[PDB]
Design a protein around this ligand. Structure first.
Ligand SMILES: O=C(NC1CCCCC1)[C@H](C1CCCCC1)n1c(-c2ccc(Cl)cc2)nc2ccccc21
Lengths: 230, 12
């Protein structure tokens, strides 16, 4: 019923690794501070996204069991979840408590960041869907780990090995949901349901970036490998 | 070839 000693160890351990990320305040601070041109915004995105991938790799490598996976599967897992993890982290930052009105400003800044209207709709649709879940810090971290250790990812040769690693994280997440939100016996399933919506950002991610309202679309060497651009 | 990713996954 309650978390075992081992499950608390895993949770805290995963929480420690997740905290190594760039703090939410840092992101929202710069966005709210001053309106940037679509040019400056695109450059902010690439630098933010490059840092996020670097930290994501270090986070992934510390996930219990990931080191014993086939080297090519390791690559396949990171390459397949990098974009989803980035939008999930954006969702967390977007729905974080800010002073009155600020949330409207942040949303307005992003809406006019230079991103194509074509993609502004689904992105905010997902962001809002996430906010309605009243997720905790531990939930975001677990969900991100679950996203990374997805066995049903492409090019994965040994899916059973990945499954074994994802199971314990799901069990912990499930217990958390049944505790932090006893009133909603659908919270856990609803968290898992957002992951499918999260996957839709994969197919038209490159188009989303290339359609940025700027003249030049330059990315970092690391982003070129992880994303499908340039 | 994903050599940057491969590097980060090996010796940082
Ligand atoms: O810095 C950002 N993301 C970081 C990615 C890496 C993880 C940290 C967050 C940008 C930021 C928006 C404004 C224009 C500059 C770029 N950002 C996005 C976002 C918009 C479009 C794409 Cl294609 C991807 C993400 N959603 C956000 C919600 C809240 C705050 C910032 C958010």
């Amino acid at each position: 019923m309650e978390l075992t000693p081992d499950q608390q160890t895993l949770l805290h351990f995963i929480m420690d690794s997740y905290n190594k990320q760039r703090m939410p305040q840092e992101i929202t601070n710069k966005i709210l501070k001053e309106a940037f041109s679509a040019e400056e915004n695109f450059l902010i995105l690439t630098e933010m996204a490059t840092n996020h991938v670097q930290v994501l790799v270090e986070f992934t490598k510390k996930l219990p069991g990931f080191q014993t996976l086939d080297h090519e599967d390791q690559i396949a897992l990171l390459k397949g979840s990098a974009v989803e993890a980035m939008f999930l982290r954006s969702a967390e930052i977007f729905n974080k408590k800010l002073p009155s009105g600020h949330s409207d400003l942040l949303e307005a800044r992003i809406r006019n960041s230079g991103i194509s209207d074509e993609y502004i709709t689904p992105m905010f649709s997902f962001y809002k869907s996430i906010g309605e879940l009243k997720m905790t810090q531990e939930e975001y971290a677990l969900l991100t780990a679950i996203v990374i250790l997805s066995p049903d990812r492409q090019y994965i040769k040994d899916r059973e090995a990945v499954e074994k690693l994802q199971e314990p994280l799901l069990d912990v997440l499930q217990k958390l949901c049944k505790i932090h939100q006893p009133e909603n016996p659908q919270h856990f399933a609803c968290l898992l349901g957002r992951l499918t919506e999260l996957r839709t950002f994969n197919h038209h991610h490159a188009e989303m970036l290339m359609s940025w309202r700027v003249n030049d679309h330059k990315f970092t060497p690391l982003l070129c490998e992880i994303w499908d651009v340039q | 070839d994903h050599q940057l990713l491969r590097y980060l996954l090996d010796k940082d």
